[PDB]
Amino acid sequence: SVKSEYAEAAAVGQEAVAVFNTMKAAFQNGDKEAVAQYLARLASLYTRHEELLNRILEKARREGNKEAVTLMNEFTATFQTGKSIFNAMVAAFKNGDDDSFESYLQALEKVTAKGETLADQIAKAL
């Protein structure tokens, strides 16, 4: 249902944010093993998140919920903007580029804040 998919997306989204924050703290402390394993976890969560939203969107469209469909389209563009920065961050880390990695973190952090706000809005709109 819209409700069971939404609740799972919320969990998956919260997990992705928490893992990102844990990964950031690890990096500032020079814990690279930890960092890479979180990158694998984050990418995984992002894929599961996209699949859930694609299903909620279809249900939102079918019930005529133009407000959710609009918000979900803003969240998804925002999410995909952040996901492009994440990809470059993974390519950098594997290349030993710490400086590039730190800059990507800050940028991703700021995109993430935009998605969090839109998340709060989607909750009220579905």
Ligand SMILES: COc1ccc(-n2nc(C(N)=O)c3c2C(=O)N(c2ccc(N4CCCCC4=O)cc2)CC3)cc1
């Ligand atoms: C139908 O669509 C949604 C959308 C959002 C939710 N949802 N619910 C909650 C909650 N109940 O708290 C949360 C989310 C969520 O997705 N959150 C999040 C995930 C990922 C990002 N990122 C990651 C890096 C790239 C940028 C970016 O935006 C930002 C925010 C915040 C937590 C449910 C259903």
